[PDB]
From Swiss-Prot:
Effect caused by changing T46A: Strongly reduced reaction rate
Site (Important for catalytic activity): Y104
Pfam short name (any one): Chalcone
Protein name in UniProt: Chalcone--flavanone isomerase 1
Transmembrane domains' residue ranges: none
Described purpose of this protein according to its UniProt entry: Catalyzes the intramolecular cyclization of bicyclic chalcones into tricyclic (S)-flavanones. Responsible for the isomerization of 4,2',4',6'-tetrahydroxychalcone (also termed chalcone) into naringenin.
Family affiliation: Belongs to the chalcone isomerase family.
Length: 220
């Protein structure tokens, strides 16, 4: 029934959004902050948020209704269903400190290639996809408040969009047509080998109450 908005360093993630690209509607699964530990201070650089298409609740209901937040958090199978579920996911990275495209994209692409190799799915096609991934970021710069949108289609496509603020762009900058790569980004965020668990905790905390309703519709 009730999802709440999350604000990370004055960057707000509304509880619900609708894509001008797909016309689909998503609910906020979780949000957190990323950065680097440099010297004796942790410096925030980006805010990160994960949205799940509204139909995801009905999809996850069968296996995960009734389970507590504590149990979901310790269950890899649950996050695999989220990562690879038959619904669209939308990931928004908003900058707290200014970063060029190559600057921000470096660590993400490294984590992706690291995982793709890890699971034996990094051939020529996947390499080209990550090259195309890189190219899309190169002509971009992200002042504070600027955002990147990863649209993970369940049909094996990753759409990349860039925005000067937190609004969803009307058009996408690039389409990376590769199944393995399409889910790679989200895997590095909530997958088994994801370092920061803040988003997993957000998902574990927020989904059970929703799954109890068996379904989610925008504005009901």
């Amino acid at each position: 029934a009730s999802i709440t908005a999350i604000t990370v360093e004055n960057l707000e993630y509304p509880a619900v959004v609708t894509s001008p690209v797909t016309g689909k509607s998503y609910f906020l699964g979780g949000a957190g902050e990323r950065g680097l530990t440099i010297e004796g201070n942790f410096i925030k650089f980006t805010a990160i948020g994960v949205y799940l298409e509204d139909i995801a609740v009905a999809s996850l209901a069968a296996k995960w209704k009734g389970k507590s937040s504590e149990e979901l958090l310790e269950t890899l199978d649950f996050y695999r269903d989220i990562i690879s579920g038959p619904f669209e996911k939308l990931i928004r990275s908003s900058k707290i400190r200014e970063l060029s495209g190559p600057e921000y994209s470096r660590k993400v692409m490294e984590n992706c290639v690291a995982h793709l190799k890890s699971v034996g799915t990094y051939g020529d096609a996947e390499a080209e996809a990550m090259q195309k991934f890189a190219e899309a970021f190169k002509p971009v710069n992200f002042p504070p408040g600027a955002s990147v949108f990863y649209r993970q289609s369940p049909d094996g496509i990753l759409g990349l969009s860039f925005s000067p603020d937190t609004s969803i762009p009307e058009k996408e900058a690039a389409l990376i047509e590769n199944k393995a790569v399409s889910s790679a980004v989200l895997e590095t965020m909530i997958g088994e080998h994801a370092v920061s668990p803040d988003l997993k905790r957000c998902l574990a905390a927020r989904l059970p109450a929703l799954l109890n309703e068996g379904a989610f519709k925008i504005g009901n």
